[PDB]
């Protein structure tokens, strides 16, 4: 033997992804590139905690999580990005409970949307699968990883099978279009197609609700933890917490007070968040409403918390 386990570490740790990938190995500490690919997700705090300033393009990303959490929230919200910049988005829908004025609040442009509401789950991964092909989809979305049911089962082994069929003839499309596709699963536990996905997935968003935002009355909203169990495209494990007030999304202005502490450039104290020398308020939601009507400001936090971090 000889050298120092390093050089000899990163010379078979380089051999290892160029024989499997670039995401094979990696050491957490890591600040590792950025393609210039990537969805915003609405959350700065979360896209900085994606570690690429979003969701990465051309890859199956999977939200789980038990119900009224937010996973669709956000995907919603993924749409209303890559859709307010020039790309096409579709939602297949097995679980027919989308919110048209939900969703318009929150930035997608629903008339340009393509929703389908397939028959099957087989049927369902086809027409996503078609549709990822002509190269015209940005971001794809399925609702329900468990609201797709083959044909058997309702005539007469199970469907991770249909899904691991469905994944792999799908990955390798998937990406040479640059169509990066969502999957919402959730309620099969608390405290069904796993199996291909949970190991497809680049990346795999647990989005479980913290608290109830109390407003003084009863309450805004809800305010959620997602972790980031698995990230192919940079480091694991990060997680971030974020508002979603009801009926109106993920509260942008709160996320940045947030992210505006937790980093410096806004100084609280007395409860009285205050942007250097320049005050916003007394009480989170009064600073978060400061915001909110001070685009202005706002975005000089917004733009100060992008360079301390992810470009
Ligand atoms: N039409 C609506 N009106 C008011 N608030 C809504 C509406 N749709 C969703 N919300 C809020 O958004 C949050 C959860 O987003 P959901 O769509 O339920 O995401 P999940 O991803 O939690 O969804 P299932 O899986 O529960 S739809 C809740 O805290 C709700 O208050």
Redesign the pocket.
Known sequence: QAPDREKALELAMAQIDKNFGKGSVMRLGEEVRQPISVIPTGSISLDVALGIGGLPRGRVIEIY?P???????VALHAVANAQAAGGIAAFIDAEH?L?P??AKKLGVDTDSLLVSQPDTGEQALEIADMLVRSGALDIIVIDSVAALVPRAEIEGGLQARLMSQALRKMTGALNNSGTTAIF?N?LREKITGGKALKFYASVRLD?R?IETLKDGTDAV??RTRVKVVKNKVSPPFKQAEFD?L??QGISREGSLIDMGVEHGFIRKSGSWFTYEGEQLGQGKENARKFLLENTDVANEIEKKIKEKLGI
């Open positions: 999580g119900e009224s959490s937010g996973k669709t929230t409970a919110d004025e939900y919402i959730q989005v609700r909203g809800n979603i009801y009926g």
